[PDB]
Amino acid sequence: MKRLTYISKFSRPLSGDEIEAIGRISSQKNQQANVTGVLLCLDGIFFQILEGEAEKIDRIYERILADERHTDILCLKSEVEVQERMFPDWSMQTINLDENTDFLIRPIKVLLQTLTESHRILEKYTQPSIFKIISQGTNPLNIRPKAVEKIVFFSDIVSFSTFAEKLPVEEVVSVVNSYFSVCTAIITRQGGEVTKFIGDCVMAYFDGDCADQAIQASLDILMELEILRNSAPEGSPLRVLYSGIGLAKGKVIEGNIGSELKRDYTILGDAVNVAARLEALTRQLSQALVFSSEVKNSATKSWNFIWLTDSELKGKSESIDIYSIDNEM
Amino acid sequence: MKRLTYISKFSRPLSGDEIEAIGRISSQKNQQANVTGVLLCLDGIFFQILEGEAEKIDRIYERILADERHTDILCLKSEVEVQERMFPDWSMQTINLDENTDFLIRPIKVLLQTLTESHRILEKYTQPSIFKIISQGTNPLNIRPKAVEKIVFFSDIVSFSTFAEKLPVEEVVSVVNSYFSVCTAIITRQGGEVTKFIGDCVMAYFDGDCADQAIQASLDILMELEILRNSAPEGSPLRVLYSGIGLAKGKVIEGNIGSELKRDYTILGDAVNVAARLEALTRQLSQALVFSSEVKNSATKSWNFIWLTDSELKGKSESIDIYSIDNEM
Ligand SMILES: Cc1cc2nc3c(=O)[nH]c(=O)nc-3n(C[C@H](O)[C@H](O)[C@H](O)COP(=O)(O)O)c2cc1C
Ligand SMILES: Cc1cc2nc3c(=O)[nH]c(=O)nc-3n(C[C@H](O)[C@H](O)[C@H](O)COP(=O)(O)O)c2cc1C
Ligand SMILES: Nc1ncnc2c1ncn2[C@@H]1O[C@H](COP(=O)(O)OP(=O)(O)OP(=O)(O)O)[C@@H](O)[C@H]1O
Ligand SMILES: Nc1ncnc2c1ncn2[C@@H]1O[C@H](COP(=O)(O)OP(=O)(O)OP(=O)(O)O)[C@@H](O)[C@H]1O
Ligand SMILES: [Mg+2]
Ligand SMILES: [Mg+2]
Ligand SMILES: [Mg+2]
Ligand SMILES: [Mg+2]
């Protein structure tokens, strides 16, 4: 079996009979698939529990994901292989109004309002990979730190401080947020994790056997930024948004790092230093992507590698050879 | 008027009549202070709404804060000057059991369980200053970016990478988390904000007219670390936990910066670069604290300033004079 719990936001205002139409189609199909649960409706927010055989649940949840009548869908729990059915049937409750609101539905309802509003805001400040772990029933705070091989990614906007002395502050922030959105979408598509924003810099990492994905993400970011520059409106600062990218590979510590008022699930280790130094090297090179020989050698695809001089980095143990990609330049 | 909403965690297991004793004393005193609301009890979690005149509310909430029977108290909303009383009276509900659990208290109750468990975890990953803004009824996502003068603080563990090649990974993380806990407590006490952890480094900031508080925090961190080293158990790695600290002052942009899966409320600007460079300079100096002449000159107390040579930084516009504190060395 399987039980899913999720919360979503109205993509637009939904009338009375519109939300009741939801409940009807859902009841019809869930009854067909032996799926029980409940769909609660509050002020512009949906919450729903649904349980049944994973195949039938996986199909339904995915029709729900495609539904354009709501957005910001966050799965709160994914309980794979449940032993007991929590609900005898499936139905819909519209508590936004009343439904016999006494001294026990009134306080409950406000608590759900306040908690959900707060949860929805906290979500936007939370590293994206935390939620998934919670859905799996494992508390990410209790993950023990471990040594793991990773590919570290650093990227950093070229000449940001200039944007800052030529644009109003709202426009500066819009440029940096556009950059981070471009980078985040591609890294995440290629299986990496954006772990930190450091000023105008993205720090990310990939599994240690994913050098090809890290290279592809980096090439795809460089190409997306070239398209963004070329397509920007006339006079847009995005026309001069450039980045450099550095990649390194090594053993790091992954775990919860921080204080008690705030922690991060992130990585520590020398490969972070190396990747950042390689990224900075792009300011002295024509290339916008640099990566270590360990990244080059761990890649499996026949990339158009170019060996850059012989390298002369500092702070490491050896001046490792450095590489980029030369795509018919 | 005023209405407070908050959630807390059991500091220890609480029996049946123990939690009912809560409700009795609360009803007695709230009835005396014309305070209405509700106290819900779920699995090891309290939620409570309380409303009344701010003075009487401020007194009660603070007796609640001191109560050792719960911990992790987070105010979810602080509605100052409420016009209408939301509750006619005050009472307690123990929904952990039943209280007529039909097809409408059962789903509600699970949603409260799941949401609260998720909220409590997200809290530990959230920059500490986000919650406060939410309590004030202002959505921090809607804060517009602004130019503001700040004192930037950077601190960074000396020779961390060594800890990493002499200790098991659980012990390495314990050392770094001890460091961040020491720094965070003092910065926050002195009115600053820890905004980011960058590997073994703390990034923080203070109001621009708070150079004295930033200096005091830095001196207090250095003294707390000296006490920690000296008091550590025999063989403890904390005995060799050292830090450097750099402080700079300047105009930065403060606002929400990030992508759509994750943003930070933080700062951008040159003073960040300067503070980090000054922090790094402590590795070439006997001093463990360095700060710019702008920090020195904006301080109002008669600190024991020492002018360090004449400075020769790079990347800035001028090799500004640098200072530290010499306390009868
Ligand atoms: C909050 C919300 C919850 C929904 N829950 C379900 C559900 O549980 N089962 C289902 O079949 N459709 C559900 N839907 C509707 C589906 O997305 C989709 O419209 C439905 O499968 C259409 O069925 P049809 O192919 O017969 O037209 C939900 C829609 C919304 C807005
Ligand atoms: C979840 C929880 C909620 C509480 N809420 C209240 C309250 O609303 N009003 C109050 O006077 N005491 C409340 N208390 C108890 C107070 O902390 C404190 O024990 C009480 O003021 C003692 O009153 P006394 O001075 O007469 O002994 C609460 C305790 C707990 C664990
Ligand atoms: N440029 C960087 N950006 C982000 N994180 C970094 C950077 N350089 C290092 N780190 C992180 O900091 C950790 C420690 O690196 P650091 O440069 O502080 O070395 P160290 O051994 O502590 O020596 P030092 O006395 O120079 O600080 C690294 O493992 C990595 O996690
Ligand atoms: N060492 C640092 N640690 C953390 N944040 C930094 C650091 N140095 C700079 N920043 C942040 O990055 C922003 C841009 O600084 P940066 O050094 O990237 O300059 P730039 O103008 O973008 O030039 P470049 O082409 O060298 O990257 C700074 O305003 C500051 O917010
Ligand atoms: Mg930059
Ligand atoms: Mg930068
Ligand atoms: Mg260090
Ligand atoms: Mg460091």
- Residue finishing a domain among A79, A108, A143: A143
Report the amino acid identity of residue A321.
Answer: D
Query: Which amino acid type is present at position B146?
Result: K
Write out the two tokens for B2: 């005023």
Q: Are residues A223 and A317 in the same domain?
A: yes
Q: Do A192 and A204 touch, CB atoms closer than 8 A?
A: yes
Q: Which residue bears the tokens 């000054």?
A: B278
- Examine the fold and report which residue of B87, B119, B143 is the final residue of a domain before the chain moves on: B143
Question: C-alpha distances in angstroms, A327 versus A31, A186, A219?
Answer: 56, 19, 10
Q: Look up residue B292 and give its two tokens.
A: 């710019």
> Beta strand A322-325 with A289-292: parallel, antiparallel or unpaired?
antiparallel
| Chain B environment of A172 (Cβ under 8 Å) | 145, 253, 268
Angle at Cα B244 formed by Cα B239 and Cα B249, nearest 5°?
150
Residues A80 and A206 in one domain: no
| A105/A214 same-domain check | no
Question: Cα dist. B216→A318, B189, B248 in Å?
Answer: 41, 10, 14
Q: Establish, for the pair of chains A and B, how many residue pairs have beta carbons separated by less than 8 Å.
A: 228
Q: Looking at CA atoms only, how far is residue B306 from chain A in angstroms?
A: 30
Closest by alpha carbon to A45, among A113, A97, A100? Answer: A113
H, E, C per residue of chain B: CEEEEEEEEECCCCCHHHHHHHHHHHHHHHHHCCCEEEEEEECCEEEEEEEECHHHHHHHHHHHHHCCCEEEEEEEEEEECCCCCCCCCEEEEECCCCCCCCCCHHHHHHHHHHHHHHHHHHHHCCCHHHHHHHHCCCCHHHCCCEEEEEEEEEEEECCHHHHHCCCCHHHHHHHHHHHHHHHHHHHHHCCCEEEEEECCEEEEEEECCCHHHHHHHHHHHHHHHHHHHHHCCCCCHHHHCCEEEEEEEEEEEEEEEECCCCEEEEEECHHHHHHHHHHHHCCCCCCCEEEEHHHHHHCCCCCCEEEECCCCCCCCCCCCCEEEECCCC
Q: For residues A242 and B76, what is the distance between their CA atoms, to the nearest angstrom? A: 41
Same-domain status, B87 and B28: yes
- Of the residues B108, B127, B143, the one at which a domain ends: B143
The encoded tokens of residue A92 equal 């819909």
In angstroms, rounded to a whole number, what is the distance separating the alpha carbons of residues B173 and A298?
Answer: 28
Residue A100's CB is within 10 A of a number of other CB atoms, namely 8
Q: Are strands B289-292 and B243-258 parallel, antiparallel or unpaired?
A: parallel
Q: By what method was this entry solved?
A: X-ray
Ligand 2 and B25: CB distance under 6 A: yes
Angstrom distance (rounded) from CA B202 to CA B179: 9
> Where does ligand 1 bind, in terms of residues with CB under 6 Å?
A 8, 22, 25-26, 29-30, 39, 46, 48, 50, 60, 63-64, 67, 69-70
Residue whose pair of structure tokens reads 């301080």 in the numeric block: B299
Tell me, using a 6 A CB cutoff, whether residue A158 lines ligand 4: yes
Q: How far apart are CA B227 and CA B219, in angstroms?
A: 12
Measure Cα distances from A21 to A13, A62, A78, B104, B247 in Å: 14, 19, 26, 20, 60
Number of domains in chain A: 2
Let me know whether B204 and B274 are in one domain: yes
Nearest alpha-carbon partner for A283 in A322, A326, A244: A244
A177 shares a domain with A138: no
For residues A71 and A173, state if they share a domain: no
A63/A78 Cα distance (integer angstroms): 16
Which segments of B are annotated as binding site for FMN? Answer: 29-30, 48, 63, 67, 69
CA distance A114 to A181: 29
What is the CA(B90)–ligand 2 centre distance, in A? 13
Residue A89 sits at the vertex; the CA angle it makes with A84 and A90, to the nearest 5 degrees, is 115
Query: Do A181 and A321 fall within a single domain?
Result: yes
Residue in B7, B128, B169 closest to A147 by CB: B169
B322 and B201 within one domain: yes
Together in a domain, B137 and B206 = no
**Annotated binding-site residue numbers of B for Ca(2+):** 156, 200, 270, 279, 310, 321
Show the domain range for A282: 144-329
Closest CA to B307 of B323, B293, B296: B323
Contact A171, A282 (CB under 8 A): no
| B62, B135: one domain | yes
